[PDB]
Design a protein around this nucleic acid. Structure first.
Lengths: 583, 583, 580
DNA sequence: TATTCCTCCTGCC
RNA sequence: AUGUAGGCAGAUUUGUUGGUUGUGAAUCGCAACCAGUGGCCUUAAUGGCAGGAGGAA
DNA sequence: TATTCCTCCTGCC
RNA sequence: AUGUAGGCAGAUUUGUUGGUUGUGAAUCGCAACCAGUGGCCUUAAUGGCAGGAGGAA
DNA sequence: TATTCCTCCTGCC
RNA sequence: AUGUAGGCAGAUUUGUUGGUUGUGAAUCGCAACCAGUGGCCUUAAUGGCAGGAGGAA
């Protein structure tokens, strides 16, 4: 329990009652799912098409066997972690279905190697039969389970005397039983001077030798023929080889480990990144991009899918950056210390494409108005205020599938390290000034596309926006005469779709920030006997604690009367932009 | 004819009358040249020696036949261009005698290939016999000329059976009839993974394989043996292979395509550039260099023989610069804010030698005074004046070849993009001040040789050189504690051979420019109601329009008398420098 | 004396008296040493252990034959230099025991080569028998010595039918007699396209070819086998080949020429440099490092040993730096806008380690206080003052060998180009300000080690150190509060072990320097009728060289005790701080 | 011739 | 007023792979640099693992 | 299954 | 109130050489890049040469 | 042992 | 005063190719880096093509 003695609890168990307690399910429910309704009668088969005529068949547990198997998976994952701790070892050979392991680390193991050999195991899960699972639980030290517990686990895991593909616990059991082959193959590889790794049923054996060892594989004119020692090592561990998938790749072609290039660095497939580039280009250009859904029929993809692809590329990009940092050797020379558009000089071409896509997502292809604020707390204030006045502004909300789960119809931009890296927007005022400065070129970079929604920058009055106001006056000149009239106006219209909303002044014309919009009954509340500092100048608590324990604290019953103004402005802006699209 | 239907006119031609009309020559003259006087009785043979005591014989036509053949060459070149346009193809395989093609593009085709194969065709022009020329004009589907026109073209184009080397129309006919072999060899090369190109009779076949294809050529233990397929392709097209000139070159030796190195980039032969470097060095030291003549005895060789070699090298340098600009790999950089002598860091060694030579030509090895004037209109005024007062100043003129053509004996320096690139003289005041700054080092860089002529810097009085003069009194000390008195003498001697000449001051000593020298009668002469803005800084015609119209145009007979001061100063400077040299 | 005439004098000599006069010894002593007392009886014999089962035996002259052979060695070295000069040639195939030649140049001859062949000659000196030396001295042009002189030289230079390993003259004689094989092998190597060099008995033949010429050496299953041509060219020159030492090295292994890596540049062995790095690290962490001795037991080892190791590495570093300077590549680019710690951007890793060691030597692990100054003559003034006041301050002195060799215990820091390169201390005041700025980080860099001695910056009064005083007021703030009283103290405590000592301020308050501390009469001294410039004039250099340095006048140091008592007060203060 | 939980997307197997 | 004539098209236009980087009206091209002319799997969930984008408390 | 000594240390052979 | 069972550890975790550069609580590791999967010697003085750190006249 | 001509020079074939 | 002798000169000094870059009292050399130890053509107009240097209109 608590990542300390789950394995001890499992070993101590002597009956299905103990096992049911460990899994945290009733004994009646467990033995009803497993035995009353035989586990062999709770699997549905589906198919994944394969280009090689046939298809890949997946057996999946129905509803409740799946829950029991997920519990077994959690138990066995914790047990494996504890075994690793006890034996004082680390996972260096298995990457497939392992916690803390990814395809990136598996590829990194073989980065830059002269020759790479790829083997695939035939019918990986069908090879783990019921006898093998039960025998592993009975015989392998560190488990040595009592017969009843081991048999119950084996029956809850297996379908037709083998591990099904779609069972949640099959991955971990496969890892546990394939550790034997892992160690044998690691010994063999180290013997013949090769790096070895596995990812599910995908074995990679690389070497820096110019010729692969003859005991591992030879390149006959017929093709790649695995050596007898390696083949017998794999077959003596109870697995077969898919002879039609054995590859031997030299440095002069693309060396791929589990989908990633390893010729020089761990990289994405160039074809994949270029296709993501082209899909983003198509989205910017017309209004969308098309992908095949099931049978080659081109259907429009969503922003979610393209963002997921870009994030997949960015995972490898970020890994490479983190690795490059540890090697960076300081150098001489200087530059402009970044300028307008000078923050993209540090970015890749892939990272430049991702930056452009993120900017599009937030400011050019946004499907709802995007609100930019000037800090980490204005977002919480705006969200709370809009939630309180939901009925006052119905048009600022969307509707879910008839469950009263209404959501805010806005993109409240959240600035963090990632938007600082890609967009150059960490929430500072200088950052917003540079944002406005570059807005023209950023807008132009999207192939004449016209955003359908406005981008509203809601920020304080006279507190932060002074240089920005000077820039607006001296450069934009969106109005015939504007010096301080827009310093006190319902809103502003800077550029194509960019608007700015300043916090309304007091009746006396005072310069009031966003927090002044709360009633006086709330600004004076003391948390732990600490006076709420006015905004942040200062025994006192800053705006962070104010937002966390006052504004978001719904029990305090904060009335957002003097917030309606701001929301009203946004509403009007929406209509205004529509008129622009109608003119 | 619109650059599209000259081929149409040739097709429509049906008699010698139509051909003569197309050529724009009287029919009687054409028939006289071709028939009354045998075309074979209008040729002269001369020789070019060959390394192996050999002879390259050239048959060249006389003037009357050469004019007709030049007209035919122009006609057929237009026809070839129109055929290329019509078939919607480009010229990618032929470079020898082609418009818009050079050896640079020929070499660029093979810029970095692993193996080059060079073949040369024996007796290239003696294989285009009369039958081939006449038949090509008869049968090619783009010509299908009437038999009489084709016969007359082949008669004019041909010496006794075959094309003569020296005929103007032989090259274009060679290209037209060698396109057949070009296509055949292009197909053959594409089959065996090789780039193919031709330049006259110089065939290059390059490949990136480490072994040249066995069917194209092999390296036997006797030399290069051409594959039977390639030999048969060349011979079936009616050409012979000069077996003594077949070469196969690896990247370990110099790979040459029509005179240029193609190992990594398209470059000049290193020996040639080094020899040009040495020739310029000899010129700087002793005032002359020596190159062999026809008889074998060394002779001086002028500044135009050199400076043609420099231009030949600069052609390749400029081509490479353009390509680098195309790629340019933009990234961070800091040039250290530039400096004196900092403009030469962007130049490679070859361009540095060229820039040094240009500076020697214009400021250290002049055969006559060099006049440097800021801008681009002052030299126009100076040339017009010096032409107007030719009688007044005979010593400022030199005679031409035979009867009489007197010309300004002064290098009126012209500033342009090339001068800014190589010398850092774009025609501004700042560049002129930097020129004066560097003059001492530039003078010292020429191995102690003393210029034989002055360098006169003609400038307006204090309007632009306000800063320059400060330098002359802050670092140079050219005058004894002079600040504003120096703006009152007809000439100034900065140092060495560098003199300055400011515009004479007005009667009241007011600041003035050389433009004010023009009489005020012709000052306005406004045309179309637009006044001529003298300073072009107050739709008023600028300084260029005024210069062209008023100054360059005759029929006004401008009274050039205010410019007599500048020429008097030039005479005084010449006398001063002559006296100084005699010291 | 007249190296060119020595060759003529030797080849003109005809009697043992002439040879003795050339060697500058009395004929009686020479002939008594060489003949009366057997030359074979004046040789001690000692062994050096070998890694294998063998041992290297060395026979060395006792003490007097050693002197005779030293004179002969100098004579023959001058003769060889003259023979090089007259022949209008230079040495290119031998680096060995040759003047002006080193292992660095020997390795540089073979720098980027594809394959390196290393041969070692067996029993090098044992192959130069007496007959061979005499025959060379007799029948070789450019010497053509009289048989008496040649026989005397051979008798002096030879053990029983051999050249002693420990004889001060065996090196040069071996070089002269191996020149024949040098030319033969140089021509042979040029024939087959190879660089050839010899260093004593270490022959290196290198080629840029990917296959070594079959006539020179070939790789068979047995190993490396030298070709017949090369083996005969060596054997017919009267030398043997140590076959077990023959090596052929491709670029995929460490290519070593006389101890140095050759693969890409001339470099130190990486294992050696890393070992020195680790030894310095152990010295910084603990109080000392350890190294094995002859008997196989670890011992402390002094700063001298580690300093020598670092200097050996720095020799190659400096050679590479000079070559890189020669090649160079002009360009424009900012260099970190100078700033602090930027001077280490020009140093590579080895040079950074050496710089750290030098800084530790002079400021952290110093065994005596280190005096820093702002100029070259300040330290001379302090040294003269301490030498004159030896009896007054025995506490600032130590016995080197106790043989009345008492010497200044104060480690008076001296500045030069090397300290500017490795420490950024050229003596300028701004450099001292930067030094005080960096002192904190430099102190922290030695793994919490506590210095055992102070470090005193002796400067003048508010003349140049004004920047230092401003920095101390606006930063550090050792004292709670000060405006200008810092200029008037016995000493100032700045950091852990760093102190500043200003001169005794004038009673009226006028700023003073080292010169003002001298008596008025001493400052007024004039040489060649020239007054001494405060800062027809004399600079500080002449003042120091002729006035302070020269004890002819028994010059008096009056305003020099005060700084000495200040130094002793600093010593006591730091001792108390350590004992705190 | 700040640390949970709950939707959706990507990728590998 | 003119003034002989011998063979053109196997009918027509930028060889190619990979990797790294940059860039482009881009579901893929182009340019540079490095290495080349072996072979080869390739519509991966509803599950595991590693991530990504949001929303609530 | 600055030009002479003296002491010490390093490295190669 | 619950409910069959047929094979695991040949018992357990980061293959390796050289060069260059950087770096590290370090008598040796680690990372980057380059080239790879041949062989091999190593206790180097009291002598010579090449240097380094100082002290004195 | 202005966009037209004219002169000269370089290079390739 | 003196204080024995056994063979060297095959008689003399920086192996070399190409590319790229830099540089030099230079018709060529030198240095760095990259790749090596195959072969080999070379006096190119008065013609064509591609350029360069100038002058007039």
């Amino acid at each position: 329990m608590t990542k300390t003695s789950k394995l001890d609890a499992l070993r101590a168990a002597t009956s299905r009652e103990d096992l049911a307690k460990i899994l945290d399910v009733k004994l009646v429910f467990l033995t009803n799912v497993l035995y009353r309704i035989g586990s062999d009668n709770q699997y549905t088969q589906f198919t994944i098409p394969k280009k090689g005529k046939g298809v890949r068949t997946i057996s999946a547990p129905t509803d409740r066997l799946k829950d029991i198997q997920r519990r077994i998976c959690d138990l066995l994952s914790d047990c494996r972690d504890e075994i690793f701790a006890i034996r004082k070892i680390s996972n260096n050979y298995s990457f497939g279905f392992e916690r803390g392991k990814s395809i990136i680390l598996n590829a990194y193991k073989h980065r830059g190697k002269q020759i790479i050999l790829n083997i695939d195991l035939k019918d990986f899960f069908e090879s783990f039969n019921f006898g093998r699972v039960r025998g592993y639980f009975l015989s392998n030290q560190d488990f040595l389970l009592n017969p009843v517990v081991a048999t119950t686990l084996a029956k809850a895991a297996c379908y037709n005397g083998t591990l099904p593909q779609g069972s949640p616990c099959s991955p971990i059991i496969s890892n546990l039983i394939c550790n034997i082959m892992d160690m044998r193959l690691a010994k063999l590889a180290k013997k013949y001077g090769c790096t070895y790794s596995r990812y599910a049923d995908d074995i990679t054996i690389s070497t820096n030798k110019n010729t692969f060892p003859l005991e591992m594989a030879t390149v006959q004119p017929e093709g790649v023929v695995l050596g007898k020692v390696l083949v017998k090592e794999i077959e003596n561990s109870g697995f077969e080889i898919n002879d039609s998938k054995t590859r031997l790749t030299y440095k002069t072609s693309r060396q791929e480990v589990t989908g990633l290039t390893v010729n020089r660095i761990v990289n994405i497939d160039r074809c994949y990144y270029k296709k993501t580039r082209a899909l983003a280009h198509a989205l910017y250009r017309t209004g969308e991009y098309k992908v095949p859904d099931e049978n080659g029929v081109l259907v429009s993809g969503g922003l979610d899918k393209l963002e997921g692809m870009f994030g997949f590329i960015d995972q490898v990009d970020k890994f490479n950056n983190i690795k490059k940092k540890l090697n960076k050797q300081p150098d001489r020379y200087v530059l402009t210390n970044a300028t307008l558009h000078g923050f993209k000089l540090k970015l890749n071409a892939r990272e430049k494409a991702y930056s452009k896509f993120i900017y599009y997502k937030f400011f050019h292809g946004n499907t709802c108005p995007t609100i930019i604020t000037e800090g980490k707390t204005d977002r919480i204030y705006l969200k709370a205020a809009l939630h309180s006045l939901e009925t006052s502004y119905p048009e600022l909300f969307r509707e879910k599938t008839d469950s009263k789960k209404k959501e805010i119809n806005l993109n409240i931009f959240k600035s963090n390290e990632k938007t600082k890296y890609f967009l150059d927007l960490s929430g500072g005022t200088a950052d917003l000034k540079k944002f406005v400065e570059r807005y023209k070129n950023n807008y132009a970079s999207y192939y004449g596309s016209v955003p359908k929604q406005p981008v509203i920058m809601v920020l304080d009055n006279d507190t932060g926006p002074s240089d920005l106001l000077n820039f607006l006056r001296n450069k934009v000149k969106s109005c015939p005469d504007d010096v301080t009239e827009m310093r006190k106006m319902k809103y502003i219209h800077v550029f194509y779709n960019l608007y700015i909303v300043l916090t309304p002044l007091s009746p006396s014309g005072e310069q009031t920030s966003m927090e002044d919009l709360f009633p006086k009954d709330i600004l004076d509340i003391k948390i732990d006997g600490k006076k709420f500092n006015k905004n942040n100048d200062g025994t006192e608590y800053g705006k962070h604690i104010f937002s966390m324990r006052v504004v978001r604290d719904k029990k305090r019953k904060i009335d957002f009367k003097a917030f309606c103004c701001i929301f009203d402005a946004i509403k009007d802006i929406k209509e205004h932009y529509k008129l622009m699209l109608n003119s």
